[PDB]
Amino acid sequence: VVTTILESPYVMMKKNHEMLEGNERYEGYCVDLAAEIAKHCGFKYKLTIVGDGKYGARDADTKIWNGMVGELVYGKADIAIAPLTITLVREEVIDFSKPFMSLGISIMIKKPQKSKPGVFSFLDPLAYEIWMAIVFAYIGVSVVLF
Amino acid sequence: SLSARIVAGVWWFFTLIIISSYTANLAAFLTVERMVSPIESAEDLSKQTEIAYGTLDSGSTKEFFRRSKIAVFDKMWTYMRSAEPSVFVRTTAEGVARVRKSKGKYAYLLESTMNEYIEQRKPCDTMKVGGNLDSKGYGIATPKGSSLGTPVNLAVLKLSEQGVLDKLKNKWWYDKGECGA
Amino acid sequence: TPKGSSLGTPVNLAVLKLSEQGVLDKLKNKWWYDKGECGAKDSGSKEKTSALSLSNVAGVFYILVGGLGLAMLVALIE
Amino acid sequence: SLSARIVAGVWWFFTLIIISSYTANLAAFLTVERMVSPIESAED
Amino acid sequence: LSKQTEIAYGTLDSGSTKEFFRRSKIAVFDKMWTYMRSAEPSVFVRTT
Amino acid sequence: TPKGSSLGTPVNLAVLKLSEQGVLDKLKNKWWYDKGECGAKDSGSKEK
Ligand SMILES: C=C(C)[C@H]1CN[C@H](C(=O)O)[C@H]1CC(=O)O
Numbered sequence A: 001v002v003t004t005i006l007e008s009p010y011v012m013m014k015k016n017h018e019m020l021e022g023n024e025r026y027e028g029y030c031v032d033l034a035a036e037i038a039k040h041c042g043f044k045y046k047l048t049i050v051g052d053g054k055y056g057a058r059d060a061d062t063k064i065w066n067g068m069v070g071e072l073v074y075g076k077a078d079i080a081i082a083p084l085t086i087t088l089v090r091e092e093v094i095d096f097s098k099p100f101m102s103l104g105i106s107i108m109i110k111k112p113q114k115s116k117p118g119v120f121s122f123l124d125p126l127a128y129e130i131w132m133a134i135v136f137a138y139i140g141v142s143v144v145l146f
Numbered sequence B: 001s002l003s004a005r006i007v008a009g010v011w012w013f014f015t016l017i018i019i020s021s022y023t024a025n026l027a028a029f030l031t032v033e034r035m036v037s038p039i040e041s042a043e044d045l046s047k048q049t050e051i052a053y054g055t056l057d058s059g060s061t062k063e064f065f066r067r068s069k070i071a072v073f074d075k076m077w078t079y080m081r082s083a084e085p086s087v088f089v090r091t092t093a094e095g096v097a098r099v100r101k102s103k104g105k106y107a108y109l110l111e112s113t114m115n116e117y118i119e120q121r122k123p124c125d126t127m128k129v130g131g132n133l134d135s136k137g138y139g140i141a142t143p144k145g146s147s148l149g150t151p152v153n154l155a156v157l158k159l160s161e162q163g164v165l166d167k168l169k170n171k172w173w174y175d176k177g178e179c180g181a
Numbered sequence C: 001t002p003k004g005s006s007l008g009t010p011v012n013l014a015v016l017k018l019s020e021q022g023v024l025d026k027l028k029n030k031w032w033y034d035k036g037e038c039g040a041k042d043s044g045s046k047e048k049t050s051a052l053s054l055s056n057v058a059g060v061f062y063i064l065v066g067g068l069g070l071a072m073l074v075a076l077i078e
Numbered sequence D: 001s002l003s004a005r006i007v008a009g010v011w012w013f014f015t016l017i018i019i020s021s022y023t024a025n026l027a028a029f030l031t032v033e034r035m036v037s038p039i040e041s042a043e044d
Numbered sequence E: 001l002s003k004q005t006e007i008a009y010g011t012l013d014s015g016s017t018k019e020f021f022r023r024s025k026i027a028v029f030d031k032m033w034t035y036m037r038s039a040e041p042s043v044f045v046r047t048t
Numbered sequence F: 001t002p003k004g005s006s007l008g009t010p011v012n013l014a015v016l017k018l019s020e021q022g023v024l025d026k027l028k029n030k031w032w033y034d035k036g037e038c039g040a041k042d043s044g045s046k047e048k
């Protein structure tokens, strides 16, 4: 039993999922990866959606794990294939395979496109240092002229 | 006074060279189509408080900012705690929606992978800027002491080595992409 | 570590610990870009503006200055 | 004086074409540098 | 063209081209056949 | 194929089936431009 969470493009419902049955009705990176791990390790598997719809965490009061990690420790599922981050608290509790993907904490911003000119940018294909030097040259040559 | 002629001549040479280099490089700028960014790096984003930025409410990213001992991130964490309206979002999609609606008011900190994905999908008006702030990884999880752990581990090894993971990655991210390259 | 060893799992936990508190990043920065002889490492990333570097125009600035100095000399001889 | 004037004209055109040439070639030189290097990609 | 939804694209109503996109198992063409399959307003045209 | 052979029609169908699956395209791209010792079109300019 391979438990996973719905995330794009990790796990997705095919447009025909109403008609499709079982493992066939899920498409995604994680799905193909499940196929590969199964083909290499030679087992038949059940693709399942996590009941809590959460990855993992420990309730502060009860100390009980939630989501797929909980599915793993408490024995609702045999394996976890999903965008699951390796952390210390999780590693203590379950065994992690070597990382199959690299990620980092990164910044997403809006794209400025065409409509935002950045007048300063068009005023400075030359570096601000060059402007410093050219003003200094302007006043210096001005005093040499006077 | 030929001293004046040498001043004016050399200075004329100077300004001519400057305006010529400007013309040349503006021609190059317009021809080549370089990428335009408002923000260089995360640390620069800390330095400039003009743009508000946020993370998800429950996740390991917020955990990173919280329990990290690194300076710049501590600064950004000080910024992220006190700001109202609440800068934290329940879903990543919601936060990115806030990035799209704000016209440059909002920056979002998230996992590089999800970032790249949303980057590739319509409207594709949002970009990933700067390098990674840290390095984590996803992995297949197994229950402790289970039989499957080590063989699925080796399977993952093989798949990384023979290029299956990379090809699959290229398939689901950029190749199924909604906009350009 | 050798297969079946006792130290592997706790040193693993230790690696994760260090990485989560940013120790590894600090170490790499220390032995790579901190001790860097060339310097301007993070510069080439954050500072890559393409555009124009001051260094190229610098020479023109120097022939301007030297021209002003020769102009000073010629002003003296007049 | 017509002589000196046509001298000034010819020299003006001369320095004109030279300056235009410098601006042109510098423009090409700088247009080149921001093109993605072929050798950079492993496949290439 | 396959990697952007900004510009719509279509083929005839019937012929070797539609049959090509339909039967083709190649990635780009499979994708374009999906796009054309679910697209509205219908992108198919009766004549050249 | 020799005139009157039993191989003619099925190899004909084989060549067709191959063409429709893009196999000829991929194989040509393999033997021609994949093993090429000068990269694409751009190599010649050398930036002037
Ligand atoms: C995408 C989400 C919400 C998940 C995926 N991995 C991280 C996890 O294992 O919690 C979460 C992201 C994050 O914490 O920034």
Ligand SMILES: C=C(C)[C@H]1CN[C@H](C(=O)O)[C@H]1CC(=O)O
Pocket (backbone or CB within 6 Å): E011, E012, E014, E015, E016, E017, E018, E048
């Ligand atoms: C013009 C039409 C409808 C015909 C002509 N040849 C192809 C055929 O005979 O199948 C069709 C072109 C196409 O399918 O786009």
